[PDB]
Write a structure and sequence with these properties.
Protein name: Maturation protein A
Organism: Pseudomonas phage PP7
Strand content: under 5%
Structural class: mainly alpha
Distance between the termini: 105 Å
Number of strands: 0
Subcellular location: Virion
Family: Belongs to the Leviviricetes maturation protein family.
Radius of gyration: 32 Å
Order of helices and strands: H
Subunit structure: Interacts with the host pilus.
Length: about 50
RNA sequence: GGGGCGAAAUGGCCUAGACCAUGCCCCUUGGCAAACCCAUUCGACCGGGUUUGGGUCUUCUGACCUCGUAGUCCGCGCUCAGCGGACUUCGACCA
């Protein structure tokens, strides 16, 4: 068992490499941008003709 | 029907921009003020119709009553009427 478990953990080690790589990939700081608009108005006056 | 708008109320588009949907802004013109007419308790009774409504001389151009609108010099004096008065213009059934 002392040798089998050691072999097993040594074989498991590489997978932790790509797992930590993916973890780091999840922390990549990226983003986009947002942009909006708006408009308000007001009548001034009016007369007949 | 004829138009307007993307403004303005929001929704697509929505650095920005210009277009879209419902969606919202107006016309359905209006007024004449007078004179006369019906059937009848053989007028009281409301409603309708006709002739006029700035106006004439040649209302053709153009002028003669009237005014309205302006611009220009104006008298500080000359003419019997007097006066405050001159010249040029456009309009004249009414909003």
């Amino acid at each position: 068992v002392a040798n089998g478990h050691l072999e097993l953990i040594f074989g498991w080690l590489p997978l932790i490499g790509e797992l930590e790589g993916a973890i780091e990939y999840a922390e990549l700081p990226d983003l986009d941008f947002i942009r909006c608009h708006g408009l308000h108005t007001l009548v001034l006056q009016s007369t007949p003709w």
